[PDB]
Scaffold this motif. Structure first.
Motif, PDB file in Angstrom:
ATOM      1  N   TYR A  21       0.843  -1.192   0.000  1.00 59.11           N
ATOM      2  CA  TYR A  21       0.000   0.000   0.000  1.00 59.11           C
ATOM      3  C   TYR A  21       0.879   1.243   0.000  1.00 59.11           C
ATOM      4  CZ  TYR A  21      -2.560  -3.729   2.424  1.00 59.11           C
ATOM      5  OH  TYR A  21      -3.075  -4.942   2.816  1.00 59.11           O
ATOM      6  N   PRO A  22       0.532   2.254  -0.802  1.00 59.97           N
ATOM      7  CA  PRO A  22       1.350   3.475  -0.866  1.00 59.97           C
ATOM      8  C   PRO A  22       1.089   4.452   0.273  1.00 59.97           C
ATOM      9  CG  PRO A  22      -0.456   3.640  -2.410  1.00 59.97           C
ATOM     10  CD  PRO A  22      -0.595   2.289  -1.750  1.00 59.97           C
ATOM     11  N   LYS A  23      -0.154   4.498   0.757  1.00 59.77           N
ATOM     12  CA  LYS A  23      -0.511   5.457   1.797  1.00 59.77           C
ATOM     13  C   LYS A  23       0.340   5.259   3.047  1.00 59.77           C
ATOM     14  CE  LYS A  23      -5.172   6.636   0.405  1.00 59.77           C
ATOM     15  NZ  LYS A  23      -6.292   5.892  -0.231  1.00 59.77           N
ATOM     16  N   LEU A  24       0.625   4.003   3.392  1.00 59.55           N
ATOM     17  CA  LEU A  24       1.532   3.728   4.500  1.00 59.55           C
ATOM     18  C   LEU A  24       2.925   4.274   4.216  1.00 59.55           C
ATOM     19  CD1 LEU A  24       0.454   0.152   5.611  1.00 59.55           C
ATOM     20  CD2 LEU A  24      -0.438   2.389   6.262  1.00 59.55           C
ATOM     21  N   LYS A  25       3.356   4.226   2.954  1.00 60.70           N
ATOM     22  CA  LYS A  25       4.631   4.831   2.580  1.00 60.70           C
ATOM     23  C   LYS A  25       4.617   6.331   2.842  1.00 60.70           C
ATOM     24  CE  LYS A  25       5.600   2.989  -1.084  1.00 60.70           C
ATOM     25  NZ  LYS A  25       5.692   2.670  -2.535  1.00 60.70           N
ATOM     26  N   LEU A  26       3.547   7.008   2.413  1.00 60.40           N
ATOM     27  CA  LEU A  26       3.405   8.435   2.693  1.00 60.40           C
ATOM     28  C   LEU A  26       3.555   8.714   4.179  1.00 60.40           C
ATOM     29  CD1 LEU A  26       0.607   9.820   0.386  1.00 60.40           C
ATOM     30  CD2 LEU A  26       2.771   8.744  -0.163  1.00 60.40           C
ATOM     31  N   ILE A  27       2.790   7.993   5.000  1.00 60.39           N
ATOM     32  CA  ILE A  27       2.810   8.243   6.439  1.00 60.39           C
ATOM     33  C   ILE A  27       4.205   8.009   7.007  1.00 60.39           C
ATOM     34  CG2 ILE A  27       1.702   7.710   8.626  1.00 60.39           C
ATOM     35  CD1 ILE A  27      -0.756   6.995   7.293  1.00 60.39           C
ATOM     36  N   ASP A  28       4.869   6.934   6.573  1.00 63.92           N
ATOM     37  CA  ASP A  28       6.169   6.597   7.142  1.00 63.92           C
ATOM     38  C   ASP A  28       7.231   7.626   6.775  1.00 63.92           C
ATOM     39  OD1 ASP A  28       4.821   4.438   8.061  1.00 63.92           O
ATOM     40  OD2 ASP A  28       5.977   2.930   6.966  1.00 63.92           O
ATOM     41  N   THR A  29       7.258   8.072   5.516  1.00 58.54           N
ATOM     42  CA  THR A  29       8.231   9.096   5.143  1.00 58.54           C
ATOM     43  C   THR A  29       7.951  10.412   5.857  1.00 58.54           C
ATOM     44  OG1 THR A  29       7.097  10.020   3.211  1.00 58.54           O
ATOM     45  CG2 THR A  29       8.357   7.973   2.898  1.00 58.54           C
ATOM     46  N   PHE A  30       6.673  10.770   6.017  1.00 59.10           N
ATOM     47  CA  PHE A  30       6.358  11.984   6.762  1.00 59.10           C
ATOM     48  C   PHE A  30       6.862  11.887   8.197  1.00 59.10           C
ATOM     49  CE2 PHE A  30       2.775  15.330   7.371  1.00 59.10           C
ATOM     50  CZ  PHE A  30       3.742  16.286   7.567  1.00 59.10           C
ATOM     51  N   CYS A  31       6.664  10.733   8.840  1.00 56.99           N
ATOM     52  CA  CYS A  31       7.138  10.562  10.211  1.00 56.99           C
ATOM     53  C   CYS A  31       8.660  10.645  10.287  1.00 56.99           C
ATOM     54  CB  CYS A  31       6.645   9.228  10.770  1.00 56.99           C
ATOM     55  SG  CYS A  31       4.990   9.287  11.487  1.00 56.99           S
ATOM     56  N   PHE A  32       9.351  10.012   9.338  1.00 57.85           N
ATOM     57  CA  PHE A  32      10.810  10.052   9.327  1.00 57.85           C
ATOM     58  C   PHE A  32      11.319  11.484   9.214  1.00 57.85           C
ATOM     59  CE2 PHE A  32      14.794   9.936   6.851  1.00 57.85           C
ATOM     60  CZ  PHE A  32      15.590   9.261   7.749  1.00 57.85           C
ATOM     61  N   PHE A  33      10.740  12.264   8.301  1.00 59.77           N
ATOM     62  CA  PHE A  33      11.209  13.637   8.140  1.00 59.77           C
ATOM     63  C   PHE A  33      10.812  14.517   9.322  1.00 59.77           C
ATOM     64  CE2 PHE A  33      13.164  14.120   3.931  1.00 59.77           C
ATOM     65  CZ  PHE A  33      12.974  12.845   3.443  1.00 59.77           C
ATOM     66  N   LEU A  34       9.709  14.198  10.005  1.00 53.97           N
ATOM     67  CA  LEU A  34       9.396  14.905  11.244  1.00 53.97           C
ATOM     68  C   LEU A  34      10.459  14.644  12.304  1.00 53.97           C
ATOM     69  CD1 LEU A  34       5.550  14.355  11.556  1.00 53.97           C
ATOM     70  CD2 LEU A  34       6.745  16.497  11.216  1.00 53.97           C
ATOM     71  N   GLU A  93     -11.229  13.160  11.438  1.00 49.57           N
ATOM     72  CA  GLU A  93     -10.792  13.443  12.802  1.00 49.57           C
ATOM     73  C   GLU A  93      -9.321  13.834  12.833  1.00 49.57           C
ATOM     74  OE1 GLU A  93     -11.932   9.803  14.857  1.00 49.57           O
ATOM     75  OE2 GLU A  93     -13.762  10.809  15.524  1.00 49.57           O
ATOM     76  N   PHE A  94      -8.498  13.146  12.040  1.00 49.03           N
ATOM     77  CA  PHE A  94      -7.084  13.491  11.950  1.00 49.03           C
ATOM     78  C   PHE A  94      -6.898  14.899  11.405  1.00 49.03           C
ATOM     79  CE2 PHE A  94      -3.822  13.869   8.661  1.00 49.03           C
ATOM     80  CZ  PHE A  94      -2.672  13.821   9.411  1.00 49.03           C
ATOM     81  N   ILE A  95      -7.652  15.256  10.363  1.00 50.22           N
ATOM     82  CA  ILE A  95      -7.562  16.604   9.804  1.00 50.22           C
ATOM     83  C   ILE A  95      -7.890  17.649  10.864  1.00 50.22           C
ATOM     84  CG2 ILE A  95      -8.837  18.191   8.332  1.00 50.22           C
ATOM     85  CD1 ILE A  95      -8.782  15.944   6.199  1.00 50.22           C
ATOM     86  N   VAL A  96      -8.974  17.430  11.610  1.00 46.78           N
ATOM     87  CA  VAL A  96      -9.392  18.410  12.612  1.00 46.78           C
ATOM     88  C   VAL A  96      -8.336  18.550  13.704  1.00 46.78           C
ATOM     89  CG1 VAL A  96     -11.047  18.833  14.450  1.00 46.78           C
ATOM     90  CG2 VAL A  96     -11.847  18.246  12.169  1.00 46.78           C
ATOM     91  N   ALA A  97      -7.838  17.419  14.210  1.00 47.77           N
ATOM     92  CA  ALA A  97      -6.818  17.470  15.253  1.00 47.77           C
ATOM     93  C   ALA A  97      -5.563  18.178  14.761  1.00 47.77           C
ATOM     94  CB  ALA A  97      -6.488  16.059  15.734  1.00 47.77           C
TER      95      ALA A  97
ATOM     96  N   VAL C  27       3.452  23.284   5.559  1.00 43.66           N
ATOM     97  CA  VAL C  27       3.365  23.119   4.113  1.00 43.66           C
ATOM     98  C   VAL C  27       3.506  21.655   3.718  1.00 43.66           C
ATOM     99  CG1 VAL C  27       4.594  23.608   1.969  1.00 43.66           C
ATOM    100  CG2 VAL C  27       4.062  25.459   3.558  1.00 43.66           C
ATOM    101  N   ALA C  28       4.208  20.860   4.522  1.00 46.25           N
ATOM    102  CA  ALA C  28       4.273  19.438   4.225  1.00 46.25           C
ATOM    103  C   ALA C  28       2.961  18.754   4.570  1.00 46.25           C
ATOM    104  CB  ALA C  28       5.434  18.795   4.979  1.00 46.25           C
ATOM    105  N   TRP C  29       2.313  19.167   5.659  1.00 45.19           N
ATOM    106  CA  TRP C  29       0.985  18.647   5.966  1.00 45.19           C
ATOM    107  C   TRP C  29      -0.020  19.029   4.883  1.00 45.19           C
ATOM    108  CZ3 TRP C  29      -3.780  20.859   6.954  1.00 45.19           C
ATOM    109  CH2 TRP C  29      -4.747  20.017   7.508  1.00 45.19           C
ATOM    110  N   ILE C  30       0.069  20.261   4.370  1.00 38.72           N
ATOM    111  CA  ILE C  30      -0.849  20.696   3.320  1.00 38.72           C
ATOM    112  C   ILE C  30      -0.639  19.892   2.044  1.00 38.72           C
ATOM    113  CG2 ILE C  30      -1.050  22.562   1.632  1.00 38.72           C
ATOM    114  CD1 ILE C  30      -1.591  24.485   3.697  1.00 38.72           C
ATOM    115  N   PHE C  31       0.607  19.537   1.732  1.00 35.47           N
ATOM    116  CA  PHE C  31       0.841  18.708   0.553  1.00 35.47           C
ATOM    117  C   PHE C  31       0.541  17.233   0.805  1.00 35.47           C
ATOM    118  CE2 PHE C  31       2.861  18.372  -3.613  1.00 35.47           C
ATOM    119  CZ  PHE C  31       3.185  17.034  -3.665  1.00 35.47           C
TER     120      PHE C  31
END
Ligand SMILES: CC(=O)N[C@H]1[C@H](O[C@H]2[C@H](O)[C@@H](NC(C)=O)[C@@H](OP(=O)(O)OP(=O)(O)OCC[C@H](C)CC/C=C(/C)CC/C=C(/C)CCC=C(C)C)O[C@@H]2CO)O[C@H](CO)[C@@H](O[C@@H]2O[C@H](CO[C@H]3O[C@H](CO)[C@@H](O)[C@H](O[C@H]4O[C@H](CO)[C@@H](O)[C@H](O)[C@@H]4O)[C@@H]3O)[C@@H](O)[C@H](O[C@H]3O[C@H](CO)[C@@H](O)[C@H](O)[C@@H]3O[C@H]3O[C@H](CO)[C@@H](O)[C@H](O)[C@@H]3O[C@H]3O[C@H](CO)[C@@H](O)[C@H](O[C@H]4O[C@H](CO)[C@@H](O)[C@H](O[C@H]5O[C@H](CO)[C@@H](O)[C@H](O)[C@H]5O[C@H]5O[C@H](CO)[C@@H](O)[C@H](O)[C@H]5O)[C@H]4O)[C@@H]3O)[C@@H]2O)[C@@H]1O
Ligand SMILES: *[C@@H]1O[C@H](CO)[C@@H](O[C@@H]2O[C@H](CO)[C@@H](O[C@@H]3O[C@H](CO[C@H]4O[C@H](CO)[C@@H](O)[C@H](O)[C@@H]4O)[C@@H](O)[C@H](O[C@H]4O[C@H](CO)[C@@H](O)[C@H](O)[C@@H]4O[C@H]4O[C@H](CO)[C@@H](O)[C@H](O)[C@@H]4O[C@H]4O[C@H](CO)[C@@H](O)[C@H](O)[C@@H]4O)[C@@H]3O)[C@H](O)[C@H]2NC(C)=O)[C@H](O)[C@H]1NC(C)=O
Ligand SMILES: CCCCC/C=C\C/C=C\CCCCCCCC(=O)O[C@H](COC(=O)CCCCCCCCCCCCCCC)COP(=O)([O-])OCC[N+](C)(C)C
Ligand SMILES: CCCCC/C=C\C/C=C\CCCCCCCC(=O)O[C@H](COC(=O)CCCCCCCCCCCCCCC)COP(=O)([O-])OCC[N+](C)(C)C
Ligand SMILES: [Mn+2]
Lengths: 110, 163, 41, 112, 34
Positions: A21-34, A93-97, C27-31
């Motif tokens: 699944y790609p969405k998990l890839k998105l989440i994981d790379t976002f977490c790594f860069f955070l 819910e994630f968007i709102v939080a 901006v990363a969250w927005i993208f």
């Protein structure tokens, strides 16, 4: 080296999952860069040996950590949904939080 | 509302009827008593009802409402230190009893992440959550829930005896 | 000093880092939201 | 000498906290900029987040509204950070969330 | 205005009506629902 066996099995399962699944890839790379952003700010503080605006440093670090926890919560709800919450609800819910956390951290940095 | 989540609606009605007139509350809620407690003790229950809805549903929205009303309370009464030390304990207990679940992680990490950063905005309570002994419990539970999520993915992966 | 009368974040060279990081994360969250909805699994 | 000229007195102020030299704080801003750029490139070129499955029927006029809600909230916060009052921010949030909620719940209902 | 013994009678009446409605509700719900 049972550690090595568990390590290799975990790597296998994880890379298989993130290719399925790609969405998990998105989440994981976002977490790594955070995590990278948090390391960068901690490194700034250590290097200069002062944290004069503690409310700004706290705002940055806390936005990073809060985004990390929220992403991990979304990932959990995505891989195995909860009983009464659909994945559209788990996304809204994630968007709102996230929006609320953004506003709070923007007010914290003055 | 808080007692309709523990047992049933009839018990919630009974509890509301009890607390409507019980003297232990009337002593500090009498007309003319314009102090912090009047409002606070309502926000305490409004926060525990959302923490129980989030803890037993896993919703992020209910955890966010719980965090918002928690912030509403740190800014009204100095006894907010109750919540910040009673919500971690609960989670902590549920970890020792072997009842960890993804709902627990979601609820608690959302509540903490939001409420702790929103409770430092009150000029009075500022920087204390990170440097005081009243809030170190919540921080420790935060860390423990991350080591436990990791170990609930890893131990779950490999066989039992291999642990 | 009132809560208004304090050198803003952009006036302190020490806080350019944290504000840059906040802007980058927003901006990363927005993208990320856009790329999470648009793309299919 | 109880009555007579007396010695002066001037208050002693403290030295305000020092701020890091500028050339040492621009390098870190550059690091963060490069890091964000690298994140966006990692998504765009690792076969993830590829821009497919874009709605184009009637639901597209809803997808744009969804985007409009998200970005608009981040614009309101920006304005607030720049000096706008808190009451104006609350009213802007109300005005932009009244239709945005509908348009963004309809988008999610139409997108399965 | 209203005196004190009247407000006492009113408080007591409100309490009694509340606790009787609560008992009736509980009886109805317990007898007609498994
Ligand atoms: C008896 C008694 O005790 N008492 C008390 C009191 O009480 C009272 C009350 O009040 C009342 N009320 C009324 C209303 O009236 C009553 O009551 P009641 O009713 O009761 O109430 P309540 O609430 O209701 O209560 C009840 C409740 C309860 C609590 C119940 C409970 C419940 C429960 C449930 C519980 C439970 C629990 C638990 C735990 C559970 C458990 C569980 C488990 C475990 C499971 O009545 C009462 C009684 O009758 O009160 C008061 C107060 O109010 C008090 O007082 C106090 O005290 C304290 C203590 O003391 C002690 O200690 C000390 C130390 O501290 C010592 O010293 C002392 O000794 C001595 O001293 C003296 C000297 O002189 C002498 O004389 C004496 O004699 C003594 O002896 C002692 O021992 C203290 O401390 C305090 O003080 C404070 O205050 C004052 C006043 O004014 C002042 O003056 C001072 O100074 C202080 O203050 C401070 O703080 C504040 C806040 O808080 C502020 O405002 C000020 O100004 C100050 O500050 C300063 O300092 C600090 C420290 O150092 C610092 O930190 C600061 O800074 C900060 O902030 C600022 C401002 O905002 C800022 O600015 C900053 O920031 C900045 O900077 C930084 C650094 O560098 C950086 O980082 C940053 O960045 C920056 O930022 C900025 O800038 C930026 C840019 O650039 C921007 O952005 C931003 O924006 C800005 O900001 C920071 O840092 C400053 O410096 C007091 O006194 C009594 O006691
Ligand atoms: C809570 O309430 C209580 C009660 O109301 C408050 O307590 C009062 O607090 C006052 C200040 O916080 C304090 O006043 C100071 O007392 C000092 C102690 O002096 C005692 O000893 C001397 C002998 O050494 C006696 O003569 C004297 O009577 C006392 O018994 C004084 O030393 C202070 O004097 C300095 O300040 C006053 C006014 O600011 C000047 O007139 C005086 O000339 C001194 O000024 C020097 O320091 C200031 C900076 O502090 C400089 O601006 C100035 O130019 C002078 O600088 C010279 O000296 C410094 C070293 O000090 C040197 O570096 C420089 O180069 C110069 O050579 C002052 O008088 C009250 O006594 C105290 N009362 C009680 C009962 O406790 C308490 O604050 C409240 N708490 C709060 C509000 O939080
Ligand atoms: C889906 C989208 C959701 C959007 C997010 C919605 C809600 C966020 C949730 C929680 C926010 C927590 C942060 C609080 C900031 C408050 C803003 C402010 O208090 O004003 C602040 C005042 O500073 C302060 O002293 C803050 C002290 C806090 C005291 C607040 C009193 C407590 C009230 C409790 C609730 C009362 C409800 C009454 C009716 C029920 C600024 O005001 P300013 O006019 O000076 O502008 C300044 C513009 N600068 C910042 C860029 C310069
Ligand atoms: C969520 C719902 C919650 C419901 C319960 C909430 C609150 C009730 C609990 C306690 C009430 C405390 C009683 C304090 C009375 C002190 C004043 C006093 O003593 O008035 C009494 C009079 O009374 C009465 O005959 C009033 C009888 C009318 C019956 C009530 C009408 C219904 C109102 C409720 C609905 C309103 C809107 C309906 C549609 C939207 C003395 O009048 P007076 O001599 O001082 O002045 C008056 C001067 N003349 C005498 C010349 C006029
Ligand atoms: Mn009080």
């Amino acid at each position: 080296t049972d550690f090595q066996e568990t390590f290799k099995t975990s790597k296998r399962a994880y890379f298989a999952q993130i290719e399925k699944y790609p969405k998990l890839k998105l989440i994981d790379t976002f977490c790594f860069f955070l995590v990278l952003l948090g390391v960068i700010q901690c490194t700034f503080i250590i290097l200069i040996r002062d944290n004069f605006p503690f409310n700004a440093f706290l705002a940055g670090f806390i936005i990073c950590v809060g985004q990390f926890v929220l992403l991990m919560s979304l990932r959990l709800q995505l891989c195995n949904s909860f009983p009464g919450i659909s994945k559209n609800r788990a996304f809204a819910e994630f968007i709102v939080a996230s929006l609320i956390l953004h506003f709070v951290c923007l007010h914290f940095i003055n | 509302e808080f007692t309709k989540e523990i047992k049933d609606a009839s018990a919630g009605l009974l509890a509301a009827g009890f607390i409507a007139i019980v003297p232990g509350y009337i002593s500090r809620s009498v007309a003319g008593s314009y102090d912090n407690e009047a409002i606070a003790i309502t926000l305490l229950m409004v926060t525990f009802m959302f923490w129980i809805k989030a803890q037993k549903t896993g919703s992020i929205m209910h955890a966010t409402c719980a965090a918002l009303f928690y912030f509403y309370m740190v800014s009204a009464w100095g006894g907010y230190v109750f919540i910040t030390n009673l919500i971690p304990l609960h989670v902590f207990l549920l970890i020792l009893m072997g009842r960890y679940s993804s709902k627990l992680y979601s609820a608690y990490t959302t509540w903490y992440a939001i409420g702790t950063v929103a409770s430092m905005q009150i000029p009075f309570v500022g920087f204390l959550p990170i440097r005081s002994n009243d809030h170190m419990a919540a921080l420790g539970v935060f860390g423990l829930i991350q080591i436990v999520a990791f170990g609930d993915f890893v131990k779950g992966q490999i066989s039992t005896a291999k642990f | 000093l009132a809560n208004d009368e304090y050198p803003r974040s952009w006036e302190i060279s020490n806080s350019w880092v944290y504000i840059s990081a906040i802007c980058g994360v927003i901006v990363a969250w927005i993208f990320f939201v856009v790329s999470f909805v648009t793309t299919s699994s | 000498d109880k009555f007579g000229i007396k010695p002066e007195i001037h208050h002693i102020f403290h030295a305000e906290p020092k701020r890091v030299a500028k050339p040492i704080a621009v390098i870190f801003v550059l690091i963060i900029f490069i890091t964000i750029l690298s994140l966006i490139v990692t998504w765009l070129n690792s076969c993830a987040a590829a821009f497919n499955n874009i709605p184009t029927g009637v639901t597209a006029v809803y997808f744009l509204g969804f985007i409009a809600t998200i970005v608009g909230f981040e614009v309101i916060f920006a304005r607030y950070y720049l000096g706008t009052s808190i009451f104006e921010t609350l009213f802007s949030s109300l005005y932009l969330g009244a239709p945005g909620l509908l348009t963004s719940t309809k988008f999610l209902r139409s997108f399965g | 205005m209203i005196s004190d013994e009247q407000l006492n009678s009113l408080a007591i009446t409100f309490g009694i009506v509340m606790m009787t409605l609560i008992v009736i509700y509980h009886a109805v719900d317990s007898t007609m629902s498994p």
